[PDB]
Amino acid sequence: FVVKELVFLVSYVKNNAFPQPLSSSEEKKYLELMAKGDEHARNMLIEHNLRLVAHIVKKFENTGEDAEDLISIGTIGLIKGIESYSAGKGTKLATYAARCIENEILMHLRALKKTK
Amino acid sequence: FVVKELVFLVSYVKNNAFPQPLSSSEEKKYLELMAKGDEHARNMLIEHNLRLVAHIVKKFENTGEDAEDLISIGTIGLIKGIESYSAGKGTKLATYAARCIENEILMHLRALKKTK
Amino acid sequence: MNKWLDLILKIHVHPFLWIIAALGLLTGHMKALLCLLLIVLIHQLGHAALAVFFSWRIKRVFLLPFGGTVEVEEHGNRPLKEEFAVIIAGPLQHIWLQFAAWMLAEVSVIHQHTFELFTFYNLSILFVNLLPIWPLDGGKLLFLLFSKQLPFQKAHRLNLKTSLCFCLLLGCWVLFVIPLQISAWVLFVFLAVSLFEEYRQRHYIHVRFLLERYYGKNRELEKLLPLTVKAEDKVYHVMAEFKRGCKHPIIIEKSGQKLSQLDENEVLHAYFADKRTNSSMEELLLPY
Amino acid sequence: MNKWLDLILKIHVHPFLWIIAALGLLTGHMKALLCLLLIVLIHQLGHAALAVFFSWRIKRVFLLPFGGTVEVEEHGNRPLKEEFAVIIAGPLQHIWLQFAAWMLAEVSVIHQHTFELFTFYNLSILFVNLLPIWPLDGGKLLFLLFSKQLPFQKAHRLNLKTSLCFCLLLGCWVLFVIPLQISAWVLFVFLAVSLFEEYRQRHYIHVRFLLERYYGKNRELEKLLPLTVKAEDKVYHVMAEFKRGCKHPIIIEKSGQKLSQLDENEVLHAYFADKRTNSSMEELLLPY
Ligand SMILES: CCCCCCCCCCC(CCCCCCCCCC)(CO[C@H]1O[C@@H](CO)[C@H](O[C@@H]2O[C@@H](CO)[C@H](O)[C@@H](O)[C@@H]2O)[C@@H](O)[C@@H]1O)CO[C@H]1O[C@@H](CO)[C@H](O[C@@H]2O[C@@H](CO)[C@H](O)[C@@H](O)[C@@H]2O)[C@@H](O)[C@H]1O
Ligand SMILES: CCCCCCCCCCC(CCCCCCCCCC)(CO[C@H]1O[C@@H](CO)[C@H](O[C@@H]2O[C@@H](CO)[C@H](O)[C@@H](O)[C@@H]2O)[C@@H](O)[C@@H]1O)CO[C@H]1O[C@@H](CO)[C@H](O[C@@H]2O[C@@H](CO)[C@H](O)[C@@H](O)[C@@H]2O)[C@@H](O)[C@H]1O
Ligand SMILES: CCCCCCCCCCCCCCCC(=O)OC[C@H](COP(=O)(O)OCCN)OC(=O)CCCCCCCCCCCCCCC
């Protein structure tokens, strides 16, 4: 019938899982509100800065463990890093967060080695 | 019979209103020519830098002021600044012209406010 | 809403679309291209306009070669009401386009061929962007219906399974009937690739949902639904069965007998803040 | 011998034109692309030859997908003759092109249908390049005709209004009567965009005109035109009536009484150098 002469088109909303990194101004105001005190700022910052967990887990393969536990350790270490962040150390926030995530993964690996 | 076979196309001249910025080498020659005594050099120097008038006047808009007076004072300020510019100090002419026109428009606005 | 104007002036276009337009301009297919572009642009603009109303983090509206795409940023961290409202922004939009086409045909601005062509293309795109697939609005309605009486993780698992089954059915139908019409093949490839992507991103989606739940702000507090669980599993296995937009008073069963009632706040805070992510749930009765 | 070298090595082409040309070469349309390219190039060089002869300041000879442009930096900068000798040189190369064609094809060098197509496209371009719409070519001739008997502001307003009304007529004819004809829609869009851009800068042209008027030193003095105004008129209003290429002595009228004639250069110098503006003729009559 009409199947011979047809065109198929797509119009959908694509939901990203990892938001793009945020520039200095908005993260500066988010940290200012952090100093004022607000949990929504924490939620927004951790949401926008979740890509580092993905990078660390991707480069930390060949270990033989699961994925859910690694992601949970990554995100809890990220939370620990953000709540302990200080602007006087003299280094980028991303590098400090990556160091914290690596430290937490190493702690988990040492704990697993001790248990095993 | 004839329509649906015409290729309209255009061929015009596109008379612009904003000349290109002058180079970094012809400026010294133009300044020397003006120093020895010339007027076409002054015309070319005050016509090449007309976009600054637009740049500052656009910032001062939405203040209940007509464009005629704003542009008139802007051009007057630019001609006053170029008329009394000294190259001994050493600074890009754009910043000097911008400061001159901004000061002139601020003075005119203050005078108008004092009149009211 | 000047963000509407910002988005409409921030509409990207894929480079292959220019080549398609060039091929369609020297051959004589401008009417079909204009109709399809108009329909897709109206769909995308309606979606973006209704999404801006709820103040989401819209990135950009761009036209890839074989359709359109709105880059919504928030995935699985909102009450289902606005999600269900925004998804229906396009299936409830072709109606007024059809009405306008009818009026223009009646006033005789357009003759009696372009009207049929436009109606055919409109009622084809409406029925194509409704199939029970993920993506396409069919999935973003069936999955929302699923997430009303089922846990989020189970709902997502069953949604992706059904999407895979229906995609395989469509692929088999296309291979059996039409061995041509490249549009079907490119649609199938797109469906497979996107299904793989949202199969791979499930862990991060779930973690995002859980973290958003923990940092809640009492978003339209709905009725409380209990949760009876034995005290012999892992805490990550008891937090999994969380419904959408509901606060759960956790009831624990010690050897088949009720022991204590705990709110989600204390257990989830002990899981995240107190770093007891891999110990147990039983010792959370007496943390100190 | 050296001036035209940069004009030769300053040709810029839009990438979309490259894509269109490549696809037209691919899909049969080879006999048509060369004709249009040759006509457009000849017309553009005809425009540029007179401009470079008058020692103007050109920028770039572009090639849009729908035509060609030769951007110059002289608006209100040169007298009527200088602009006319360049504008008329556009619709004056098609004559010698037709003279060459009617002798080359008649001696039977190539074929008949090629000559027929060439003549069709050439005449179509020639009669499209003379619609009284800004900018095109006929519109600028109409603007020149107005400017010679009207004040500059009056000419620049009446020309704008006439171009606007003709643009609306063309848009109505294209949208409501003629079939699709994408080459007409693109023409209408380009005309509307250019007209709006010209309207948005209806103010800097006047100040450029006055500024150029300030620094004319014995610029081939011409007809002296008495001008008379009242005494309470503002300085800007009396300066608004300055037609191109005319020196205007000013006669002030103090409600039936005239004090003394004032030179135009005196008033203009009072405007710019002495900054004695925002006042009436009484202030300029009695200085510091
Ligand atoms: C700066 C340089 C730019 C150069 C651009 C490309 C240059 C090539 C121009 C391409 C173009 C005009 C398009 C111009 C749009 C561009 C506007 C830009 C706007 C940018 C946004 C000129 O193409 C002409 O080339 C001539 C050479 O052969 C031919 O006419 C000569 O005439 C004889 C004498 O009378 C001679 O004796 C003889 O030799 C030739 O027959 C024809 O091919 C044609 O007239 C092709 O137009 C197209 O129109 C449409 C419907 O009209 C046609 O579609 C289909 O036609 C039927 C057949 O499929 C289908 O059944 C139908 O379904 C469909 O309708 C196309 O087919 C094509 O015709
Ligand atoms: C951002 C939007 C992007 C949209 C893209 C372009 C959208 C434009 C659609 C383009 C397209 C559909 C193909 C879609 C595939 C694209 C998939 C995209 C994947 C990207 C990777 C038009 O399809 C429709 O266009 C309509 C235009 O009028 C016409 O319908 C009519 O309209 C009114 C007039 O009568 C009436 O009222 C109405 O009753 C009619 O029905 C018909 O042409 C047709 O119905 C292509 O046409 C296709 O069909 C035929 C030609 O006929 C071609 O067959 C060829 O024939 C020989 C001659 O070469 C070849 O020798 C042969 O080999 C080959 O078999 C196909 O090959 C293909 O050309
Ligand atoms: C933003 C767009 C407007 C809202 C969308 C509503 C949907 C429009 C439905 C009309 C039929 C489908 C049209 C698809 C193209 C087509 O196929 O046009 C084909 C017809 C050809 O007419 P004919 O050859 O049959 O005439 C036969 C003569 N004997 O040209 C049209 O009629 C175009 C006129 C209607 C288009 C809307 C005009 C809007 C005016 C204001 C502009 C605002 C921005 C517009 C941006 C383009």
Side-chain angles (χ1 to χ4, degrees), chain A residues 1-108 111, chain B residues 1-108 111, chain C residues 1-252 256 264-288, chain D residues 1-252 256 264-288:
Chain A
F1 287 162
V2 298
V3 65
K4 285 194 30 170
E5 293 83 3
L6 266 181
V7 59
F8 292 123
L9 288 187
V10 61
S11 53
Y12 74 113
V13 286
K14 174 169 184 178
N15 297 115
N16 278 311
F18 303 137
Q20 70 276 17
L22 73 165
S23 179
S24 66
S25 176
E26 65 272 18
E27 61 86 20
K28 274 322 181 73
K29 78 170 191 281
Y30 274 135
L31 265 75
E32 282 329 288
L33 172 43
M34 185 64 72
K36 314 322 181 43
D38 183 52
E39 281 268 14
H40 183 266
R42 312 171 62 88
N43 186 6
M44 185 64 72
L45 194 167
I46 303 159
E47 181 146 50
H48 283 171
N49 202 251
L50 188 60
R51 174 161 311 81
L52 294 174
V53 176
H55 294 285
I56 301 299
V57 176
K58 183 160 141 282
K59 324 172 181 263
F60 264 61
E61 197 44 280
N62 320 304
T63 307
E65 316 166 299
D66 71 286
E68 277 178 354
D69 291 331
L70 276 296
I71 301 307
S72 193
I73 295 290
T75 182
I76 187 176
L78 172 64
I79 297 169
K80 254 40 171 181
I82 317 304
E83 66 182 1
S84 167
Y85 190 56
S86 175
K89 178 168 274 152
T91 188
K92 205 43 190 173
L93 165 67
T95 67
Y96 190 13
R99 204 161 321 171
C100 295
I101 297 169
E102 293 179 353
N103 188 2
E104 291 263 349
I105 301 299
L106 294 174
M107 183 278 288
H108 188 308
Chain B
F1 56 104
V2 60
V3 176
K4 275 301 300 293
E5 199 177 348
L6 278 79
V7 193
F8 277 124
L9 298 182
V10 298
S11 306
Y12 61 107
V13 68
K14 188 74 148 72
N15 265 336
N16 284 320
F18 287 151
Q20 284 291 11
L22 196 147
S23 68
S24 315
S25 179
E26 293 179 353
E27 183 178 1
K28 294 72 178 183
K29 199 185 56 145
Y30 264 101
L31 281 195
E32 291 292 328
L33 184 64
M34 192 193 67
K36 312 183 281 283
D38 194 60
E39 293 83 3
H40 193 237
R42 190 173 307 135
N43 264 147
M44 294 299 291
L45 268 183
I46 62 170
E47 178 146 315
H48 277 164
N49 311 139
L50 203 65
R51 305 156 286 223
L52 316 178
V53 171
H55 271 167
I56 296 89
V57 169
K58 174 202 51 53
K59 187 181 70 176
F60 283 167
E61 272 203 354
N62 291 321
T63 51
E65 292 310 311
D66 53 354
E68 301 285 300
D69 311 345
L70 266 288
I71 300 305
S72 71
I73 317 304
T75 65
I76 280 182
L78 190 136
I79 198 74
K80 188 39 170 41
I82 190 167
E83 211 176 50
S84 70
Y85 155 74
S86 307
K89 304 176 290 183
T91 305
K92 274 312 181 213
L93 188 152
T95 49
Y96 207 51
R99 187 222 290 170
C100 285
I101 174 178
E102 281 216 280
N103 188 14
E104 285 283 316
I105 312 176
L106 280 154
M107 187 69 42
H108 158 80
Chain C
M1 319 177 181
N2 284 47
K3 179 63 160 143
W4 202 329
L5 274 299
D6 292 331
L7 294 174
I8 196 167
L9 282 72
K10 289 327 163 171
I11 294 172
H12 296 227
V13 292
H14 208 255
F16 202 73
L17 185 63
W18 295 141
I19 302 174
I20 294 171
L23 260 183
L25 192 142
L26 317 186
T27 303
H29 288 149
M30 211 55 38
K31 252 177 69 173
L33 199 55
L34 273 181
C35 292
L36 291 196
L37 184 148
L38 188 45
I39 275 165
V40 168
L41 198 60
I42 295 314
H43 201 159
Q44 295 298 109
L45 266 295
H47 262 295
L50 183 62
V52 172
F53 174 48
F54 279 106
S55 66
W56 290 5
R57 323 171 212 181
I58 297 90
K59 275 220 298 175
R60 44 143 168 75
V61 177
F62 84 100
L63 275 75
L64 61 83
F66 54 91
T69 288
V70 161
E71 281 303 7
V72 176
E73 198 80 333
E74 295 176 339
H75 194 167
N77 60 327
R78 324 283 310 200
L80 82 173
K81 294 298 293 295
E82 65 269 20
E83 188 71 30
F84 182 76
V86 178
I87 301 299
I88 205 173
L92 208 49
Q93 187 149 10
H94 291 158
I95 301 314
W96 77 263
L97 292 175
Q98 170 67 8
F99 194 11
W102 183 257
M103 182 179 72
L104 268 295
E106 173 57 31
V107 65
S108 178
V109 172
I110 48 172
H111 65 279
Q112 275 265 1
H113 294 88
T114 308
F115 175 83
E116 293 82 3
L117 181 52
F118 191 59
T119 46
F120 180 37
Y121 276 175
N122 169 43
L123 269 297
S124 176
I125 294 171
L126 187 139
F127 280 164
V128 175
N129 286 8
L130 193 142
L131 271 183
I133 305 297
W134 166 274
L136 319 173
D137 303 2
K140 289 165 197 301
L141 294 174
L142 185 61
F143 159 65
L144 276 70
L145 204 62
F146 274 20
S147 74
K148 202 145 187 93
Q149 292 83 16
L150 264 74
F152 191 94
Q153 177 163 359
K154 161 155 190 155
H156 207 67
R157 157 192 328 274
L158 183 62
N159 175 27
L160 63 85
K161 279 211 190 325
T162 57
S163 184
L164 173 61
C165 182
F166 273 51
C167 172
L168 294 174
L169 272 193
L170 166 71
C172 275
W173 173 73
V174 176
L175 188 153
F176 184 37
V177 190
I178 300 106
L180 277 296
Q181 203 168 358
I182 288 188
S183 178
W185 295 130
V186 65
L187 181 66
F188 184 77
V189 173
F190 180 76
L191 282 194
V193 165
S194 181
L195 213 49
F196 201 66
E197 264 192 354
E198 280 86 0
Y199 181 76
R200 214 169 40 100
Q201 273 174 20
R202 61 180 186 275
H203 284 332
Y204 301 101
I205 297 169
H206 178 71
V207 168
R208 272 184 75 184
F209 162 56
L210 193 39
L211 171 153
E212 164 68 30
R213 266 296 278 288
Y214 181 42
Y215 291 10
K217 292 301 283 293
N218 284 327
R219 290 177 176 177
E220 196 69 29
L221 287 166
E222 181 172 77
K223 47 179 213 163
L224 309 177
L225 277 300
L227 195 146
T228 316
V229 58
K230 55 192 151 303
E232 280 87 10
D233 277 333
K234 202 63 170 296
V235 61
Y236 182 76
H237 300 347
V238 67
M239 65 183 73
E241 42 184 2
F242 275 4
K243 283 214 313 185
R244 196 168 216 183
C246 295
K247 173 193 315 286
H248 296 57
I250 301 299
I251 290 282
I252 193 66
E264 72 175 4
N265 264 287
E266 55 262 20
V267 63
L268 191 57
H269 181 97
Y271 182 76
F272 272 8
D274 303 67
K275 301 181 70 145
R276 294 321 71 201
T277 185
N278 194 354
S279 54
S280 72
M281 65 183 73
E282 306 90 5
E283 294 67 70
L284 282 71
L285 283 178
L286 274 79
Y288 285 112
Chain D
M1 291 285 178
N2 202 6
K3 293 184 292 186
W4 305 324
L5 302 199
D6 63 358
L7 186 47
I8 292 151
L9 61 83
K10 263 161 177 300
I11 287 276
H12 289 110
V13 287
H14 197 287
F16 203 51
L17 192 78
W18 272 132
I19 283 304
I20 286 177
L23 271 298
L25 179 136
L26 177 51
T27 187
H29 317 309
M30 181 265 258
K31 197 163 62 173
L33 192 81
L34 303 192
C35 284
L36 286 180
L37 271 190
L38 184 62
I39 291 179
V40 165
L41 215 53
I42 286 307
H43 190 274
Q44 296 272 280
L45 273 70
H47 267 314
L50 277 296
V52 75
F53 168 80
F54 281 162
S55 282
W56 273 23
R57 194 141 41 62
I58 62 185
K59 183 189 287 184
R60 268 148 40 91
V61 178
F62 210 77
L63 283 180
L64 290 182
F66 57 89
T69 76
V70 61
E71 307 174 356
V72 309
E73 311 303 9
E74 315 293 330
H75 194 275
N77 220 352
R78 310 258 175 220
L80 295 193
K81 302 167 168 62
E82 319 277 342
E83 271 166 90
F84 176 47
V86 168
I87 296 299
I88 193 66
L92 213 64
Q93 293 296 297
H94 292 167
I95 291 172
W96 85 268
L97 294 174
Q98 181 84 352
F99 183 83
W102 182 65
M103 291 327 197
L104 203 73
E106 183 178 1
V107 75
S108 66
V109 67
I110 52 172
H111 190 272
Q112 208 79 351
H113 292 88
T114 286
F115 166 88
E116 294 167 353
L117 170 65
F118 194 102
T119 301
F120 184 34
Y121 279 7
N122 196 333
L123 272 299
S124 174
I125 293 292
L126 189 43
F127 293 100
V128 175
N129 264 207
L130 290 174
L131 267 163
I133 299 183
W134 186 279
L136 282 184
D137 275 17
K140 287 181 189 295
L141 287 198
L142 180 80
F143 168 81
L144 291 204
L145 196 157
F146 291 166
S147 172
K148 205 193 292 179
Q149 303 84 310
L150 277 296
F152 194 89
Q153 270 181 343
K154 311 307 213 307
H156 203 288
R157 284 193 323 212
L158 259 53
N159 175 23
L160 213 49
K161 285 177 90 213
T162 51
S163 74
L164 183 63
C165 72
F166 287 170
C167 168
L168 276 296
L169 292 175
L170 181 63
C172 182
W173 179 60
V174 163
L175 272 70
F176 277 35
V177 177
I178 301 299
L180 193 74
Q181 202 35 57
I182 185 68
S183 167
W185 283 58
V186 66
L187 187 75
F188 174 73
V189 176
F190 158 83
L191 276 189
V193 166
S194 190
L195 183 63
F196 170 56
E197 198 279 333
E198 179 45 52
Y199 184 109
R200 224 180 51 188
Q201 275 155 21
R202 60 181 138 72
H203 273 177
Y204 294 0
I205 301 314
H206 186 211
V207 74
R208 276 189 64 155
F209 175 43
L210 275 180
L211 187 153
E212 210 281 336
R213 178 141 281 273
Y214 194 12
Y215 303 95
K217 275 76 63 181
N218 202 354
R219 295 271 71 80
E220 282 273 354
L221 267 76
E222 67 273 15
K223 303 183 294 295
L224 187 150
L225 192 146
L227 189 151
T228 299
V229 296
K230 295 153 288 314
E232 201 57 35
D233 291 331
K234 302 288 107 178
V235 65
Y236 194 67
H237 312 337
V238 65
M239 294 182 286
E241 302 147 28
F242 278 155
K243 67 188 63 62
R244 293 179 66 187
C246 295
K247 208 260 185 162
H248 292 351
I250 308 85
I251 296 301
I252 62 170
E264 180 212 23
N265 64 7
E266 189 162 3
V267 175
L268 183 62
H269 169 278
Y271 184 14
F272 285 168
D274 291 331
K275 210 189 300 161
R276 225 176 188 284
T277 180
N278 189 359
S279 296
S280 171
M281 301 325 88
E282 293 83 3
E283 283 91 4
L284 288 74
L285 195 61
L286 195 53
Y288 306 100

